[PDB]
């Protein structure tokens, strides 16, 4: 399937409490592999996945130097936006950026993106074409004009189409045993009694990778999608994921309901009943 390289950046001002909190987190697919945090004892870019041990000390030095530069850039950005939006220095504010590229199974580029947000709202975003920007409001329009007349989209397009894809491939090669693996879900159903003759059936799916999975309850063929209570797939702290889906049913008639689990580690979808 298609793979992705994502960098999540967040800058948070904290007036009185010093200079802003700055963090960068990188993901190859759903797996975290690099991190930077300004609050660390001594802030460095560092690995979060074992396979990144294959990069030498020159890699980590350059990433750290990049991050140090980016921190200063987002400090300025934070101060700039105070002027633009006419806000006081006493309040805390957040800038978030998501940047990445996605490649197909053959390693060729599918799409690239970068989006900025201020205090949780869309600020400025690169378009599908990778040539132009789109601004959410008038503060972002000022930024839009700065970036057009400096040719920022040209430098970013080069990074996304060239540099981003080339390193993603290397990460997929170096981390193949981790990134290209497939852990199958182990599933089971739990029974939970309730008032007024009802029963909650919960279908669990544990220890699977990658994260993409479908849980569904059925009754005589039809999928109970709207009547399902659900949680978003969630990491289990070891590079695997888990999920559960539940539905309320009448007492005694539990066997007529069935849970179906669709995952790429399951050549045939699981079907559990109780």
């Amino acid at each position: 399937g298609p793979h992705s390289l994502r960098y999540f950046v967040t800058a948070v001002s904290r007036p009185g409490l010093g200079e802003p909190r700055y963090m960068e987190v990188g993901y190859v697919d759903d797996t975290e592999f690099v991190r930077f945090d300004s609050d660390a004892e001594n802030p460095r870019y560092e690995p979060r996945a074992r396979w990144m041990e294959q990069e030498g000390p020159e890699y980590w030095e350059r990433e750290t130097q990049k991050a140090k530069g980016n921190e200063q850039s987002f400090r300025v950005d934070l101060r700039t936006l105070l002027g633009y939006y006419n806000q006081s220095k006493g309040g805390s504010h957040t800038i978030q950026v998501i940047s990445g590229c996605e490649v197909g199974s053959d390693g060729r580029l599918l799409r690239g993106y970068q989006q900025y947000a201020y205090d949780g709202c869309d600020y400025i975003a690169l378009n599908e074409d990778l040539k132009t920007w789109t601004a959410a409001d008038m503060a972002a329009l000022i930024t839009k004009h700065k970036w057009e007349q400096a040719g920022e989209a040209e430098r970013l397009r080069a990074y996304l189409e060239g540099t981003c894809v080339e390193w993603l491939r290397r990460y997929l090669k170096n981390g193949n045993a981790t990134l290209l693996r497939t852990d199958s879900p182990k599933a089971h159903v739990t029974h939970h009694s309730r008032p007024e003759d009802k029963v909650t059936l919960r279908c669990w799916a544990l220890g699977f990778y990658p994260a993409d999975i479908t849980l569904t309850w059925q009754l005589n063929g039809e999928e109970l999608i709207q009547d399902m209570e659900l949680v978003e797939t969630r990491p289990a702290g070891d590079g695997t994921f888990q999920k559960w889906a539940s539905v309320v049913v009448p007492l005694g008639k539990e066997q007529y309901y069935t849970c179906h689990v669709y995952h790429q580690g399951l050549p045939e979808p699981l079907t559990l009943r109780w």
Binding site: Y7, V9, E24, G26, V34, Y45, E63, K66, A67, G69, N70, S73, F74, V76, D77, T80, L81, Y84, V97, S99, Q114, A139, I142, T143, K146, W147, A150, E152, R155, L156, Y159, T163, C164, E166, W167
Partner: peptide, 9 residues
Amino acid sequence: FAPGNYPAF
């Protein structure tokens, strides 16, 4: 390889 230049707003 993280982005090395976020241009200022």
